Amino acid sequence: LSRLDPPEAEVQIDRLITGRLQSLQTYVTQQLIRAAEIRASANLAATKM
Amino acid sequence: VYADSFVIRGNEVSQIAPGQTGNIADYNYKLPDDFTGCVIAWNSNKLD
């Protein structure tokens, strides 16, 4: 904003938002896949207990 | 359909656009950045 008008700043900020929103989707998808693995391990540990 | 109407010099016709700078678009007539109209401009040196 400091060095650009709104008409063009909306486009530049929208690009950054899309990029960082993709970062969050990658993060959350991997946590779900990895949480299933620790859950399977907790089920094995409970069964052995 | 709101029709605004005025006269301006010829090197400032490019300032009637959404998001522009210069002594017409700053404080004489500011188009919004949410613009969906149509800007029409023609010479009138033979009249005005």
Kindly report how far apart the N and C termini of chain A lie.
60 Å
**Rg calc of chain A:** 21 Å
Order of helices and strands of chain A: H
How many distinct helices of chain A? 1
The level of helicity of chain A is: over 70%
Residue share in β-strands of chain A = under 5%
Sheet of most strands of chain A? none
Q: What does the overall shape of chain A look like?
A: rod-shaped
Structural class of chain A: mainly alpha
What kind of assembly state do the chains in view correspond to? Answer: part of a larger assembly
* Strands of chain A, count: 0
PDB class: viral protein/immune system
Keywords: SARS-CoV-2, viral protein, VIRAL PROTEIN-IMMUNE SYSTEM complex
Entry title: cryo-EM structure of Omicron BA.5 S protein in complex with XGv289
Chains A, B: Spike glycoprotein
Explained architecture:
This is part of a larger assembly, with 2 copies of chain A. By secondary structure, chain A is an all-alpha fold. Helices cover 88% and strands 0% of the residues of chain A. Chain A is built from 1 helix and no strands. Chain A has one helix spanning 6-48. Chain A is rod-shaped and about 65 Å long. Chain A starts with 5 loop residues before the first helix and ends with a helix. The interface between A and B is small, with 5 and 5 residues. Chain B: This is Spike protein S1. Chain B: Residues 9-11 are annotated as: Integrin-binding motif.
